[PDB]
Amino acid sequence: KCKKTTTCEPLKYNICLGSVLPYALTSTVLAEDSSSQDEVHDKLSLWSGLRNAPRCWDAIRPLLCAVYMPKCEGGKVELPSQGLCQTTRVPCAIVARERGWPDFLKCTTDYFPEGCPNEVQNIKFNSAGQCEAPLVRTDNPKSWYEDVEGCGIQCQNPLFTNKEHREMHIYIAIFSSVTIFCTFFTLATFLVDWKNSNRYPAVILFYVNACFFAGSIGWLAQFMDGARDEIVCRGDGTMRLGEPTSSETLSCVIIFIIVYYSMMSGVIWFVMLTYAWHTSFKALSGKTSYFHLITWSIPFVLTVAILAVAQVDGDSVSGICFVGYKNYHYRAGFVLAPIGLVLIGGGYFLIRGVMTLFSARRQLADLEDNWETLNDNLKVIEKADNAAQVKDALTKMRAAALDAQKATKSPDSPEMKDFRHGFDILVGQIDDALKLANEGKVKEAQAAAEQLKTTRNAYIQKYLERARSTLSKINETMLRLGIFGFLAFGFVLITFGCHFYDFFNQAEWERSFREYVLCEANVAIAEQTNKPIPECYIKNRPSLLVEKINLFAMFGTGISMSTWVWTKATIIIWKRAWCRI
Numbered sequence: 001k002c003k004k005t006t007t008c009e010p011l012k013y014n015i016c017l018g019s020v021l022p023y024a025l026t027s028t029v030l031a032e033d034s035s036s037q038d039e040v041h042d043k044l045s046l047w048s049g050l051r052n053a054p055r056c057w058d059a060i061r062p063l064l065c066a067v068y069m070p071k072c073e074g075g076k077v078e079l080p081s082q083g084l085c086q087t088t089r090v091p092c093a094i095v096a097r098e099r100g101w102p103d104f105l106k107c108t109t110d111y112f113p114e115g116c117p118n119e120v121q122n123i124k125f126n127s128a129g130q131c132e133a134p135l136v137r138t139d140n141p142k143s144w145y146e147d148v149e150g151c152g153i154q155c156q157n158p159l160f161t162n163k164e165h166r167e168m169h170i171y172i173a174i175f176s177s178v179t180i181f182c183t184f185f186t187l188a189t190f191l192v193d194w195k196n197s198n199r200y201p202a203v204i205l206f207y208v209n210a211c212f213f214a215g216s217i218g219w220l221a222q223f224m225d226g227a228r229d230e231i232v233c234r235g236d237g238t239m240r241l242g243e244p245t246s247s248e249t250l251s252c253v254i255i256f257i258i259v260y261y262s263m264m265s266g267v268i269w270f271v272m273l274t275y276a277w278h279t280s281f282k283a284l285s286g287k288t289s290y291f292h293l294i295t296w297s298i299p300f301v302l303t304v305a306i307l308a309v310a311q312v313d314g315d316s317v318s319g320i321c322f323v324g325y326k327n328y329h330y331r332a333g334f335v336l337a338p339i340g341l342v343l344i345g346g347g348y349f350l351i352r353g354v355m356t357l358f359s360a361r362r363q364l365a366d367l368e369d370n371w372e373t374l375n376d377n378l379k380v381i382e383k384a385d386n387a388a389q390v391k392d393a394l395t396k397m398r399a400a401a402l403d404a405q406k407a408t409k410s411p412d413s414p415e416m417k418d419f420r421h422g423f424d425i426l427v428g429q430i431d432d433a434l435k436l437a438n439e440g441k442v443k444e445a446q447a448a449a450e451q452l453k454t455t456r457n458a459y460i461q462k463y464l465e466r467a468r469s470t471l472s473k474i475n476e477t478m479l480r481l482g483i484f485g486f487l488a489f490g491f492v493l494i495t496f497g498c499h500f501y502d503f504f505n506q507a508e509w510e511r512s513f514r515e516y517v518l519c520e521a522n523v524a525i526a527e528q529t530n531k532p533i534p535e536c537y538i539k540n541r542p543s544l545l546v547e548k549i550n551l552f553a554m555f556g557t558g559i560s561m562s563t564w565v566w567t568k569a570t571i572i573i574w575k576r577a578w579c580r581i
């Protein structure tokens with residue numbers, strides 16, 4: 001009979017000599033030189049050396065597959081046919097010459113019954129139409145998926161259909177367009193006034209927007225007439241993997257270099273910005289030539305490293321080439337680590353900056369408090385009847401004015417000498433009015449308070465109104481740094497979240513995809529043999545919404561840094577260049 005009784009075990013390898021197996025179970029009973037599937041892989045590795053004889057290899061492939069890795073299903077294994085065995089004797093007679101034929105490979109009808117339907121005869125080892133979606137026939141050995149011969153992994157992402165590709169593409173279109181023209185607006189602002197806007201750290205924003213401009217250029221390069229397929233796909237319609245590979249158009253690695261280098265420089269310029277802010281608050285242009293070197297070297301070294309390990313992969317969905325798609329331990333290495341360190345450092349100099357800021361924010365506010373006390377107490381004194389209120393409020397004025405005088409790089413400067421003298425006059429007159437108030441003389445002290453008013457205006461109002469507008473500037477800086485802080489931290493948190501999700505479930509997504517590939521590989525043979533075919537699908541796939549969020553995060557960063565130039569002071573600068581008369 002064409003069937004033998006044995007226990008079916010799962011295929012440890014779903015490929016038989018470069019050809020996908022349409023079944024999932026096998027048995028090592030027919031392979032009388034093997035007891036386990038590991039042994040089977042060893043013996044087939046021994047048979048592998050016969051591939052240098054295409055004439056024999058072509059004819060011995062189906063026999064070897066039908067014997068060593070047969071289809072087991074429901075406790076039954078199908079034995080290879082007599083004809084199949086006879087198709088091997090004539091061309092592979094060489095095997096009989098050197099070492100002879102194994103007894104289980106001899107065409108004895110007990111091993112190879114006559115007229116038995118075999119599942120392998122349907123399989124074509126040289127793929128004319130064997131290549132089944134998501135695989136495309138490529139004769140280039142650098143594109144072949146795993147060990148499979150003739151078939152390569154298709155270019156377009158086999159996890160998302162066209163209907164999703166168009167969606168994500170128009171999404172990226174919109175966002176990257178907004179970013180490219182916003183960044184272009186910032187650039188144009190700091191460029192038309194290149195003579196007046198070239199200052200630190202105001203030019204650091206210009207550099208950030210420059211980087212995020214180049215990056216968005218790289219992101220938009222995929223929208224030309226047939227450029228996308230030129231960047232993402234190889235010459236044989238298989239997705240570019242492990243780039244840069246030899247003898248392939250550099251249309252991919254260029255885009256990768258653009259996107260990645262521009263991104264990394266664009267996010268190290270953040271650290272430079274925070275440092276520049278801290279040093280600006282702590283007080284200069286002595287280290288202004290050293291920031292460049294870091295911000296251009298580190299992304300360069302990183303990019304060169306990625307090109308050195310050749311881990312540039314092409315994505316049809318995003319429409320670009322980026323690091324660590326296939327191997328997710330590279331994206332976490334070259335994206336999450338630098339961005340993370342950037343977050344740490346920039347955060348450090350941010351909080352340092354707002355500490356250097358908070359230390360003065362309290363001082364100025366205290367001086368203002370003293371002034372407040374002076375004003376309200378003068379309000380009470382000028383308009384009062386009881387001579388106790390005058391004494392009290394004059395004492396309070398004395399305390400407040402004394403406390404204000406005890407404030408501060410040179411305490412011996414002529415300004416500090418003068419400022420304290422005014423409070424000497426004020427405190428003195430306050431004490432005179434105090435002497436008047438103690439003796440019960442109400443209206444005399446009240447009349448001696450107007451002296452305090454005119455003296456307040458003359459000697460104190462100067463420095464006060466000088467340090468009155470600063471509390472607005474300091475608060476504006478504080479709140480805009482609050483903005484930048486709680487925004488950048490948000491973006492980093494979100495992108496770290498997305499990247500971590502993909503990093504988490506990529507271990508399962510590959511499993512699902514592989515199972516799917518095997519399933520459709522079964523469908524291929526199952527169709528052209530009038531056999532019942534099973535519906536195949538992907539068990540689980542990456543969420544498009546997550547990628548949407550990540551893109552929204554990075555492009556959101558690209559937009560939020562372009563918004564910084566959007567001020568009322570900018571709009572008028574444009575007019576100076578061409579207003580004429």
Ligand SMILES: CC(C)CCC[C@@H](C)[C@H]1CC[C@H]2[C@@H]3CC=C4C[C@@H](O)CC[C@]4(C)[C@H]3CC[C@]12C
Pocket residue numbers: 033043046047049050094095097098099100102
């Ligand atoms: C004819 C001359 C050039 C020798 C060619 C050697 C190669 C092509 C062939 C000839 C005979 C073949 C062997 C025949 C018998 C066996 C025993 C089996 O359990 C393992 C495979 C093994 C070991 C084969 C390996 C491949 C083999 C060694």
